[PDB]
Amino acid sequence: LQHIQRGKLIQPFGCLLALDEKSFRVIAFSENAPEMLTTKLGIGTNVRSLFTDPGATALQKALGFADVSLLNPILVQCKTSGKPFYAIVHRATGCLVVDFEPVKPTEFPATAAGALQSYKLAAKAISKIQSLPGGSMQALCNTVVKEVFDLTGYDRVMAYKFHEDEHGEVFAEITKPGIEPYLGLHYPATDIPQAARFLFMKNKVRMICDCRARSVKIIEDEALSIDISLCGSTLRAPHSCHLQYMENMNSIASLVMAVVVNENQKRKKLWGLIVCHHESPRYVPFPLRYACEFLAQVFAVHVNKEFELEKQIREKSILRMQTMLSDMLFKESSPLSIVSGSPNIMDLVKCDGAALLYGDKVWRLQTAPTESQIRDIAFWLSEVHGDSTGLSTDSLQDAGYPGAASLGDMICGMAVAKITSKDILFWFRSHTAAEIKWGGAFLEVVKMKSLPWSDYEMDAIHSLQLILRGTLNVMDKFTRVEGDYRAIIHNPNPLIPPIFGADQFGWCSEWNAAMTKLTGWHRDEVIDRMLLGEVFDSSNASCLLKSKDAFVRLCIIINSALAGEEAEKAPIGFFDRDGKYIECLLSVNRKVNADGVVTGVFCFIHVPSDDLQHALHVQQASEQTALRRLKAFSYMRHAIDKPLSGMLYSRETLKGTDLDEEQMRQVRVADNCHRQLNKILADLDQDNITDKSSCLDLDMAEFVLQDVVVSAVSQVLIGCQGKGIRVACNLPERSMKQKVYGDGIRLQQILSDFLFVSVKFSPAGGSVDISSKLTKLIDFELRIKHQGAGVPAEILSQMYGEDNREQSEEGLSLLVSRNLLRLMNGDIRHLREAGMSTFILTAELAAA
Amino acid sequence: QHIQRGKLIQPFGCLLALDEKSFRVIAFSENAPEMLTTKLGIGTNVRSLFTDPGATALQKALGFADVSLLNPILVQCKTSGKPFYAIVHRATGCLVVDFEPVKPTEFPATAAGALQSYKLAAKAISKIQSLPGGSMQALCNTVVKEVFDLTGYDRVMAYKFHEDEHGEVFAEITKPGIEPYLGLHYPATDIPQAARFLFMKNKVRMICDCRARSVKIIEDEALSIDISLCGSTLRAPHSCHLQYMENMNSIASLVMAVVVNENKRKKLWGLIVCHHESPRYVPFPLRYACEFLAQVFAVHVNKEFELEKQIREKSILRMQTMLSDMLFKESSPLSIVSGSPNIMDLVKCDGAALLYGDKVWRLQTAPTESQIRDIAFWLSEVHGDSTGLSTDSLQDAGYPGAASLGDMICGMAVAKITSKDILFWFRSHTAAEIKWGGAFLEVVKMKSLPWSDYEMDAIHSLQLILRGTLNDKFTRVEGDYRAIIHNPNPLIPPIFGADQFGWCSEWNAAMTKLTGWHRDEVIDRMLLGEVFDSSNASCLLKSKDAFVRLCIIINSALAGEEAEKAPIGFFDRDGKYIECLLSVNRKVNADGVVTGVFCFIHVPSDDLQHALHVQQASEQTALRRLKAFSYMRHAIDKPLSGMLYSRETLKGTDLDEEQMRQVRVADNCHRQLNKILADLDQDNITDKSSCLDLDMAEFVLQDVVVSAVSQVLIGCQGKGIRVACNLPERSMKQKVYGDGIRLQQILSDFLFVSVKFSPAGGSVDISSKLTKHLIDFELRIKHQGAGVPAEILSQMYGEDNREQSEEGLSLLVSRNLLRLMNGDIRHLREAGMSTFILTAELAAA
Ligand SMILES: *[C@@H](C)[C@H]1/C(=C/c2[nH]c(/C=C3N=C(/C=C4\NC(=O)C(C=C)=C4C)C(C)=C\3CCC(=O)O)c(CCC(=O)O)c2C)NC(=O)[C@@H]1C
Numbered sequence A: 001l002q003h004i005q006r007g008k009l010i011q012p013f014g015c016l017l018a019l020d021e022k023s024f025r026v027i028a029f030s031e032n033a034p035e036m037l038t039t040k041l042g043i044g045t046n047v048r049s050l051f052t053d054p055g056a057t058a059l060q061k062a063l064g065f066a067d068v069s070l071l072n073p074i075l076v077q078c079k080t081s082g083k084p085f086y087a088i089v090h091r092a093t094g095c096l097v098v099d100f101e102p103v104k105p106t107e108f109p110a111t112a113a114g115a116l117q118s119y120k121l122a123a124k125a126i127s128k129i130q131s132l133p134g135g136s137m138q139a140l141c142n143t144v145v146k147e148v149f150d151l152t153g154y155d156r157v158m159a160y161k162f163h164e165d166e167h168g169e170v171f172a173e174i175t176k177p178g179i180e181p182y183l184g185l186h187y188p189a190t191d192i193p194q195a196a197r198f199l200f201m202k203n204k205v206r207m208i209c210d211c212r213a214r215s216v217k218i219i220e221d222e223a224l225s226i227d228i229s230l231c232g233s234t235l236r237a238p239h240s241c242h243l244q245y246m247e248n249m250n251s252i253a254s255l256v257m258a259v260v261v262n263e264n265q266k267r268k269k270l271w272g273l274i275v276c277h278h279e280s281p282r283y284v285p286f287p288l289r290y291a292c293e294f295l296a297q298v299f300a301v302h303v304n305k306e307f308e309l310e311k312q313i314r315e316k317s318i319l320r321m322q323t324m325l326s327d328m329l330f331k332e333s334s335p336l337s338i339v340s341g342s343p344n345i346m347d348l349v350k351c352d353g354a355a356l357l358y359g360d361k362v363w364r365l366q367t368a369p370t371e372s373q374i375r376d377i378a379f380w381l382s383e384v385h386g387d388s389t390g391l392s393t394d395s396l397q398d399a400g401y402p403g404a405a406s407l408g409d410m411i412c413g414m415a416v417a418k419i420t421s422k423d424i425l426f427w428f429r430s431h432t433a434a435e436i437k438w439g440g441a442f443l444e445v446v447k448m449k450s451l452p453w454s455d456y457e458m459d460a461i462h463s464l465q466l467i468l469r470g471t472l473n474v475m476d477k478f479t480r481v482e483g484d485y486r487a488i489i490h491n492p493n494p495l496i497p498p499i500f501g502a503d504q505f506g507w508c509s510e511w512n513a514a515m516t517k518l519t520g521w522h523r524d525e526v527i528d529r530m531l532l533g534e535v536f537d538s539s540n541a542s543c544l545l546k547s548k549d550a551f552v553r554l555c556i557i558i559n560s561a562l563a564g565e566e567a568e569k570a571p572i573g574f575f576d577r578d579g580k581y582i583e584c585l586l587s588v589n590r591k592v593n594a595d596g597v598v599t600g601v602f603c604f605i606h607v608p609s610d611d612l613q614h615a616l617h618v619q620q621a622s623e624q625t626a627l628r629r630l631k632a633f634s635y636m637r638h639a640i641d642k643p644l645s646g647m648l649y650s651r652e653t654l655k656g657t658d659l660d661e662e663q664m665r666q667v668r669v670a671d672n673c674h675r676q677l678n679k680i681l682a683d684l685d686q687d688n689i690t691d692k693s694s695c696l697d698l699d700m701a702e703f704v705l706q707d708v709v710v711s712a713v714s715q716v717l718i719g720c721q722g723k724g725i726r727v728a729c730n731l732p733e734r735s736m737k738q739k740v741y742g743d744g745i746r747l748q749q750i751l752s753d754f755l756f757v758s759v760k761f762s763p764a765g766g767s768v769d770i771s772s773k774l775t776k777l778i779d780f781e782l783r784i785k786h787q788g789a790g791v792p793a794e795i796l797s798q799m800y801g802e803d804n805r806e807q808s809e810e811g812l813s814l815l816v817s818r819n820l821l822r823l824m825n826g827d828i829r830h831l832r833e834a835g836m837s838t839f840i841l842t843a844e845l846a847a848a
Numbered sequence B: 001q002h003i004q005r006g007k008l009i010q011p012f013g014c015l016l017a018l019d020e021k022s023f024r025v026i027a028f029s030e031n032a033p034e035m036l037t038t039k040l041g042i043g044t045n046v047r048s049l050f051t052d053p054g055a056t057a058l059q060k061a062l063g064f065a066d067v068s069l070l071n072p073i074l075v076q077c078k079t080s081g082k083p084f085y086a087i088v089h090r091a092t093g094c095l096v097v098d099f100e101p102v103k104p105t106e107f108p109a110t111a112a113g114a115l116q117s118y119k120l121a122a123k124a125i126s127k128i129q130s131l132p133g134g135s136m137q138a139l140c141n142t143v144v145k146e147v148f149d150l151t152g153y154d155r156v157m158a159y160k161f162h163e164d165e166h167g168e169v170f171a172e173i174t175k176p177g178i179e180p181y182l183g184l185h186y187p188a189t190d191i192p193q194a195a196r197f198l199f200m201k202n203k204v205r206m207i208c209d210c211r212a213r214s215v216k217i218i219e220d221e222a223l224s225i226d227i228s229l230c231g232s233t234l235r236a237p238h239s240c241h242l243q244y245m246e247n248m249n250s251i252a253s254l255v256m257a258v259v260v261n262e263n264k265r266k267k268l269w270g271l272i273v274c275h276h277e278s279p280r281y282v283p284f285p286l287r288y289a290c291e292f293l294a295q296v297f298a299v300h301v302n303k304e305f306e307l308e309k310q311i312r313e314k315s316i317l318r319m320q321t322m323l324s325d326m327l328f329k330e331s332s333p334l335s336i337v338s339g340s341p342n343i344m345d346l347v348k349c350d351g352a353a354l355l356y357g358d359k360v361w362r363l364q365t366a367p368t369e370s371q372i373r374d375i376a377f378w379l380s381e382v383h384g385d386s387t388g389l390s391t392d393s394l395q396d397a398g399y400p401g402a403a404s405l406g407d408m409i410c411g412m413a414v415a416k417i418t419s420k421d422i423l424f425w426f427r428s429h430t431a432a433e434i435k436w437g438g439a440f441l442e443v444v445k446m447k448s449l450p451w452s453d454y455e456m457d458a459i460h461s462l463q464l465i466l467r468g469t470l471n472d473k474f475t476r477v478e479g480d481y482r483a484i485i486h487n488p489n490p491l492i493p494p495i496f497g498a499d500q501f502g503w504c505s506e507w508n509a510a511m512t513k514l515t516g517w518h519r520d521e522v523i524d525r526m527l528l529g530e531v532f533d534s535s536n537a538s539c540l541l542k543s544k545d546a547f548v549r550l551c552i553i554i555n556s557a558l559a560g561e562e563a564e565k566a567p568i569g570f571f572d573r574d575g576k577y578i579e580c581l582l583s584v585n586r587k588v589n590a591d592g593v594v595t596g597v598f599c600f601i602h603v604p605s606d607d608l609q610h611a612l613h614v615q616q617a618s619e620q621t622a623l624r625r626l627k628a629f630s631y632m633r634h635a636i637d638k639p640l641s642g643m644l645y646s647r648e649t650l651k652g653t654d655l656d657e658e659q660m661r662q663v664r665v666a667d668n669c670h671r672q673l674n675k676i677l678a679d680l681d682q683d684n685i686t687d688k689s690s691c692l693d694l695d696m697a698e699f700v701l702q703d704v705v706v707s708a709v710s711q712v713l714i715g716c717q718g719k720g721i722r723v724a725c726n727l728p729e730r731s732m733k734q735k736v737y738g739d740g741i742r743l744q745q746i747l748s749d750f751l752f753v754s755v756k757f758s759p760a761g762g763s764v765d766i767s768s769k770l771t772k773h774l775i776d777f778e779l780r781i782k783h784q785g786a787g788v789p790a791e792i793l794s795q796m797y798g799e800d801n802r803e804q805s806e807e808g809l810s811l812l813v814s815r816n817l818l819r820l821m822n823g824d825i826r827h828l829r830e831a832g833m834s835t836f837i838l839t840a841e842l843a844a845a
């Protein structure tokens, strides 16, 4: 690191000057600076003398105030020859470094700069980043790398990712055709030393022009007791080993940006780097570098948003299983009833199988070891781990179980639970497959390791332990993570939601430990009292409410629950024994008897976090009842189904009777278009509505393309007859009859959409010609040619931008056609020649 | 005064007094010994009077510190087991027990608690909780109707107290033959303040009969402390109350107070007064149920109070936005007369005028030019010191004239921007009249709506803006003729702006007040980095993410797209966090070159901010759902054209006659499908009115019924349901005139809903009858098993069933269509089967 700070070298693509703040006089200068700055500069020269007034005034004004990086690009004209330069000044402890870069004359009209030009060029890459739905890191990385690729034009663009063990993994990348990819690789922690990361925290952009270019030394004043550090400057020479490492990667001009993410003024850590590479020397102007840095910043912001979304998603699962536990405690849960009923031991935690040993009998679910070896497992647990109870591990071999060959490769992670000495519970998980490529290229495989058991997932099992043991009614139990061969002791705190109840006459009858903690009132001080008036009241009670309106609402809720209709999550709030306001969500379940007489209520409370209490819990209630559409044509979706069934039955009866080839082909065409109709309405499910591009799967089937083409013609031939146009399909017979494997319905929809567009846009007397090409995997090419004015420019531009909400019906439809086409690695090519319009469709199919 | 001194009770129940500690009787009613024993002198204990259970319960209830929680205590007397409700009150250091007879009508009352009283009145609460808010009259009507249904009294009203304590009958429900009293105002002296205090103490007052003589209570000679039975429900009526009761032609009554929080402090909104022509009795559980209903109504009043505040705040925000827009483009005094933001929308009025450059411009209803000159002269002469004035009235305002001029104008607001030029706002009078039952009337035709303080605040702001853009002393009398008050505010939003290079170039005074900085300390500095920066600046932001978002907002605004109401937050000079909304508008010169931005900041209250956030988050889901559904609606079209083509070919091709009917059924089904898609006509009106444009043409009913059957034959086969159609061939095939396409849907959706709930192995029987030219068509569809659930059956019986389920909606629409052509639907359930009877009127061919 000290060599980097104390080194005096620069790249030959610019010049460097050192000025004194109090005197504005040159102290040190680049060796090549006099040669193309005066095409004589010396120590103590005044920078005003050697630069023209329009630029010298700007430079002198910029040198004044401290925070000088606000207007960094200063276009400056040399007095001697009038060559344009970019002046970029960096503050330092008495150094005041200045960098001059040569402007590219090809964009000389770009005079007049500032931090506001060509960041309107990064506006597209920002406005299309914002439009992505969240929850998908891979999509965000793909979009970011693709936009950096498009903006900069470098060969390779990557998204280098740092893991918890500071080892790099290429998360996403894009590259020019004809270049070897590097996606999926993994790199050790020694590639990027801590000095590089410490520098990238400070200098967020690093750029190198040529790897083989010779560095230029810098001379300095002999009276300088303090060396001029070039750490701030962007003209610093490459370091003695970075050069060799990038030489081994066959790269020359790399451009590296750092992504800074809060560690979770918060502490901030590097999520990774954006690294652009090239094979030949390359140069980039300053505004593009600034725009890319700003793009990295907004990428980091969206990464933070993804972290918050993941935290909320993880938080909701606490409430879900708390509700499950409350439901399991509401009814008397026997060890027999738990295994059979719907809230079984297969949904308490995400597990691959479950088992139960009690009453000297064994029950299993899904995948579990047989009756023989499960008793040996119980015996081993009893002998080795006698005093401590509760075990969790992801590998029986790591613990040291002797007999595991009989179990097999599957069923590797084991979690146990002990209600008492004999009766015990089992959860069984299967080990996953891990595969990482190092390429320092060798393959590394790790087997027989299952997913780790989170302390949350053991707290759930502990709560189930307590519930079952209390219902059946061993002491001071302690469980182990078994992360390594050494055994460490848990401190598992249970979580059971606060629960209280009242009988049919309104007297309080239940007050458990969680409520005792929440309110502070011990059970003995609240029981045998009126629930509404003596315990919960706004005037004189143990837990005062906010106001009389809240008490009235609570009475309404309790009485309505006693009447038959049960609440699910009603927000309430009250003051505890210490006077602190508590806000929570209360739910009441009616309690009935065998004879059908209501005995009372059974209320339980879970308190979510403030962020979760607001978002999606108060803001959202069926989108806060966005019932605007719920009447308009929502009834149509239901009402159109029955006539569809009517004509399916009609077509079945039609095909039941004896018909020759001519009618059979038409019946097949009908059935094909009806299947297309059912398929398109199949996508109308809310699962594909919440996220439009969520499900992108296809139906594999064997089909003949001739039927697809015939139906495509027939779906628009009515309009063709209406406008009196002729459609000709010049397709070879032998190639058209060969079966293919794929989804002909989606290609059918796409073609038919293109034919509809062409027929609508072509006036009367026109012609449509469809030609087919089969290349041998089968490459299918379809050319549709028509005459007329062609597709209007506005619709073409609309259909070339998916994010455009101005999407006309034709434009939206064509965008969906391309989105479907991209699934099988297809592309649409539009050509306009002599006024004729040609559409080229490419597809890949599996030969039968 | 003597609200507690009177030792008289209405003889419909007994009363006893009990010592605080000894639990012994001191005083008893004169009729108590006869109704409780047949000695009842100074008895030793009340436990020996009643049987064990009741006596034990009464002793326990007397034991508790709080007694109001166990008011209904059913007790029995050992003499003959007469059931008595025993209500216990605890006041003035003594207990008072009231025993009301339990009528043998409802001998198994089984209430005995404050829980069955609620369940007596659950449906009314459910009705009130479903009403959309914002309308007080609908809530009053619903509450009074539910109370009328519950109690069963002849006459009921809601009695509303105004600010001057004069009471108005806001609503009323009466049985036929009773003179209505709606809207008749009453003097404020009808209700003395003692009654209001009692109603704030006791929420129920009930009188069985106003003519029956009262009886007294025998007090203990030894005791020297009065019972003071003020809190008991057996208190006798007051004499003047009796006179006003007989004045109102009511003989029995029961009233309940409505207490709402006043803006914790609470006040009496009014009463819910029930009246009868003959003496009536109501048992205690019904009284408690109605009191709880009154409490629910009082709860629901407060949110209607809050909605008005939210509306007012939104209006203030909108006018601030209008003021900012007016400042955005330099507005000359001559630009507001004809431009889009004219002086009409600033404050509600009926006309406007302007006098600039000795030229007069008028808008909407306003006096003539000479009258404008005379008003200007009188304003200059009489009030020369004032520069802003507003009179609700002009005849008595001190202006000689405007009497024979007329013009139907009373209110006038005038603002003086400069020495000799003024704006105008003319307001026409509203016909106001009140009617006093005790009838007479008071009519005022010379007073308009008053000038609100905020409506003058707007005028002051507009005057300031115009004076500033044309370019001290601030006096503004807003009293008509007698009063004089002054000191209005600007309420101009905080405004700032940045040059095209990012340099700050404008800092409003309101912004100075909001942030604490000064214009000279912030001008000519970079807006992003030196003024609004996350690390070292004048007004620090929360974090780097907020700074990046603000940079994105400003740069996007400079690019030609404007942001409105984007939430931001920052620390002021004193370290106080401020959360507000920012809106940026691009500023473009007349040559087509932009020259910076122009930002202004709203500061809504927390509740309004929460509501705005909720609505802004909610609208997006509806937008995307609409977009997706429109795509789906368009994309349906393509394959139906192909199916129609193919069916046309099949019909064209030579085919036997037996499939002619099959192809016809298909085509009928397809055109029926086309019908609903063609029903994009403004959310079809349906109901009885609906669209009377039903297809009028000849057809065959048998084909329609066959198509309807085939529409559900697939589901019938799936579930293995056997369908029998016993239709007479001669009658079923007879030609008729009318609509058959809609009838197909009417029979098909009913068949589908019958099939859906059909148990496995069930059977469906369909019969058709023709009555005789006009033919009455009767279709009976019978299926076994339970049948349609009661919820869907009710939701088909009527249309007011909250949100409507898909099958329920379909059946509703079917009922509307049936009612269109004089048809009706009847459902019968007898011994585990459901049958639907469908009646239609058709014209025979
Ligand atoms: C004589 C001194 C004045 C007087 C005295 C008085 N009034 C009350 C109580 C009530 N007055 C009521 C008035 C109305 N009832 C109606 O039918 C309507 C309107 C539709 C009116 C104006 C009512 C009702 C009450 C409240 C009690 C109730 O029974 O509901 C009292 C107190 C009596 C008591 O002992 O509680 C007194 C002393 N009222 C008058 O109007 C005359 C001029």
Ligand SMILES: *[C@H](C)[C@H]1/C(=C/c2[nH]c(/C=C3N=C(/C=C4\NC(=O)C(C=C)=C4C)C(C)=C\3CCC(=O)O)c(CCC(=O)O)c2C)NC(=O)[C@@H]1C
Pocket (backbone or CB within 6 Å): A004, A158, A168, A182, A187, A190, A191, A192, A193, A195, A196, A199, A206, A207, A208, A238, A239, A241, A242, A245, A249, A254, A256, A273, A275
């Ligand atoms: C020298 C013996 C070791 C070494 C030293 C070293 N490396 C850097 C900096 C970088 N190395 C990078 C590596 C990668 N980028 C990629 O695209 C890939 C793979 C596809 C990898 C692994 C990156 C990134 C940098 C930064 C480049 C930049 O321009 O800053 C440094 C710091 C140099 C400096 O600028 O101070 C040093 C000392 N790297 C090695 O792996 C060898 C063994």
